[PDB]
Amino acid sequence: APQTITELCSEYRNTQIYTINDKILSYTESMAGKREMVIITFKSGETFQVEVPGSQHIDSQKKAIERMKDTLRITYLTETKIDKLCVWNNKTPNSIAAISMKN
Amino acid sequence: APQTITELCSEYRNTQIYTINDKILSYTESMAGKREMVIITFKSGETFQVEVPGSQHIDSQKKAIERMKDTLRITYLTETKIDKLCVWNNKTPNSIAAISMKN
Amino acid sequence: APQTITELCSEYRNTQIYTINDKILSYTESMAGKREMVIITFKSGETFQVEVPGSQHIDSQKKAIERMKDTLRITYLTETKIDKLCVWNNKTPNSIAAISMKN
Amino acid sequence: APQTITELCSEYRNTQIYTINDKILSYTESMAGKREMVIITFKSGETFQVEVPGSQHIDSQKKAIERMKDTLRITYLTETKIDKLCVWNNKTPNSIAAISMKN
Amino acid sequence: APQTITELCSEYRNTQIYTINDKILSYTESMAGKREMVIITFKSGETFQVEVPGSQHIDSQKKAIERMKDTLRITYLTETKIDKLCVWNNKTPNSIAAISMKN
Ligand SMILES: O=c1[nH]n(CCc2ccccc2)c(=O)c2cc(O[C@H]3O[C@H](CO)[C@H](O)[C@H](O)[C@H]3O)ccc12
Numbered sequence: 001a002p003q004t005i006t007e008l009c010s011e012y013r014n015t016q017i018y019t020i021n022d023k024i025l026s027y028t029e030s031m032a033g034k035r036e037m038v039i040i041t042f043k044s045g046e047t048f049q050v051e052v053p054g055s056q057h058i059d060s061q062k063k064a065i066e067r068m069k070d071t072l073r074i075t076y077l078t079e080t081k082i083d084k085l086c087v088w089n090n091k092t093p094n095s096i097a098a099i100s101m102k103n
Numbered sequence: 104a105p106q107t108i109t110e111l112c113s114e115y116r117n118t119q120i121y122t123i124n125d126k127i128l129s130y131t132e133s134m135a136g137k138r139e140m141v142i143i144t145f146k147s148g149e150t151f152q153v154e155v156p157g158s159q160h161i162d163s164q165k166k167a168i169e170r171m172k173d174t175l176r177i178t179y180l181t182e183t184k185i186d187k188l189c190v191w192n193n194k195t196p197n198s199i200a201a202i203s204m205k206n
Numbered sequence: 207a208p209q210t211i212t213e214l215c216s217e218y219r220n221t222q223i224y225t226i227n228d229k230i231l232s233y234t235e236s237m238a239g240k241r242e243m244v245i246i247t248f249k250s251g252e253t254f255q256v257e258v259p260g261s262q263h264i265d266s267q268k269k270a271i272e273r274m275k276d277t278l279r280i281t282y283l284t285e286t287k288i289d290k291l292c293v294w295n296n297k298t299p300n301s302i303a304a305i306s307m308k309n
Numbered sequence: 310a311p312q313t314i315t316e317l318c319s320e321y322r323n324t325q326i327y328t329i330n331d332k333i334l335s336y337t338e339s340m341a342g343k344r345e346m347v348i349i350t351f352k353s354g355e356t357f358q359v360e361v362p363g364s365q366h367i368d369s370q371k372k373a374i375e376r377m378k379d380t381l382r383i384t385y386l387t388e389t390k391i392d393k394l395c396v397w398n399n400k401t402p403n404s405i406a407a408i409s410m411k412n
Numbered sequence: 413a414p415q416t417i418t419e420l421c422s423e424y425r426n427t428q429i430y431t432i433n434d435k436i437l438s439y440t441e442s443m444a445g446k447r448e449m450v451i452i453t454f455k456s457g458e459t460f461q462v463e464v465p466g467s468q469h470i471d472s473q474k475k476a477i478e479r480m481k482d483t484l485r486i487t488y489l490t491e492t493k494i495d496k497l498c499v500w501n502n503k504t505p506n507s508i509a510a511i512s513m514k515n
Pocket residue numbers: 341342343424425426463468469470473500502503507
């Protein structure tokens with residue numbers, strides 16, 4: 001298995017690592033039909049989403065998607081610094097594949 | 104996908120954005136039959152609800168409804184400021200569709 | 207939908223509102239067979255329970271019962287002030303139907 | 310329904326109350342096959358477990374077992390004082406049936 | 413049942429105890445397909461993973477796997493010192509079987 005978020009990120013196509021090194025500026029969450037998602041933004045202006053579960057996801061990712069959203073909420077509420085984000089860049093806003101927190 | 108609560112709120116009928124810029128004043132939770140819901144109010148007295156799951160909700164919203172309630176509870180407890188709320192105004196109290204929080 | 211806990215409480219038989227205005231004094235949780243419940247007490251001596259799931263509950267209440275217990279534990283741990291409790295008084299201890307929190 | 314931990318503990322055979330009046334000293338959690346459990350210790354020298362779910366448990370105890378482990382973890386992390394523990398004395402280490410915390 | 417993490421760990425093949433006595437330096441979580449996992453690292457340079465649920469795991473471990481990840485995230489956020497880790501050394505990074513934390 002990969003040992004860092006970057007090794008993991010590189011195993012997928014259409015992804016890139018954004019080094020954030022900052023807490024989340026804003027947290028947005030929706031329970032509206034077909035837009036069950038979360039959006040985060042940083043002081044930098046960067047904006048990312050955890051996509052609505054869809055046909056592209058396998059069963060195993062379903063539980064992971066709910067965990068990622070749980071993680072973003074608590075990270076935001078605790079003003080925890082995010083290290084890096086591995087995101088899919090073929091989506092607007094870019095989609096979160098993985099996250100690392102340090103410091 | 105939409106990248107802000109405003110973009111998201113613009114995709115639905117019967118909705119509007121309320122700029123709260125304040126923490127939740129009170130949190131109310133019910134497990135009473137047919138009233139399994141949450142109600143929050145702000146200092147202004149303005150009140151909102153997360154609706155009891157019903158026919159107007161599609162399957163993907165089931166987990167989202169539960170998450171929204173988890174979110175309101177923890178934001179109340181942490182005295183976290185709510186920035187805006189996208190709500191359906193065809194319900195009383197107005198019904199929460201999305202929420203944003205900012206630091 | 208009702209706008210306050212008192213409004214909600216009035217829709218049911220065998221209920222009453224207790225104005226608490228205090229943090230929880232003790233929290234008790236049991237996983238013993240047929241006694242899977244939670245009991246809380248206040249400096250006032252007032253004791254309340256979240257009942258063991260049973261035939262008196264409809265499907266929609268199963269998740270609500272679990273959430274209420276989650277709320278009481280975190281409310282206790284954070285020393286969060288409870289405003290009111292809507293309880294069924296046809297049980298001993300009085301059974302929790304809804305709770306409101308405000309400082 | 311019982312109103313106190315002592316009251317509840319008394320309804321069962323092979324159980325007894327331990328007055329802890331202390332925070333948990335150490336917390337252990339295992340996901341090893343057939344040993345999916347939690348072990349806690351106190352400066353007193355006492356060790357206790359939340360048993361691996363098994364044939365001795367009824368269905369209604371399933372969610373309760375998972376809740377108890379959630380409780381012990383957060384109790385440990387917040388250095389919350391435990392009042393009493395109701396345990397089955399017919400297991401080694403003693404098995405937790407109910408817990409109480411007081412302010 | 414075992415009373416300490418070392419006893420427990422010894423009940424399995426391909427395991428060993430890593431003594432940490434330090435908080436988690438970084439927390440990494442992935443929702444990427446087939447890589448739904450968590451990786452943690454320490455200032456020592458040691459790196460560990462909670463494996464993607466797989467054919468080696470029995471059902472009782474599935475729920476336990478999700479708990480371990482919940483535990484690692486909150487331990488990280490609270491900067492709680494970890495005492496020991498029982499890990500499977502036939503995986504890279506080594507795989508977490510159990511954790512222990514002490515006051
Ligand atoms: O057959 C195996 N038995 N045990 C004993 C308990 C158990 C587990 C599963 C089924 C029945 C009984 C094992 O502990 C065990 C471990 C083992 O290791 C693989 O799985 C673990 C995760 O449990 C981890 O992924 C290791 O790296 C794997 O080798 C294989 C077979 C086992």
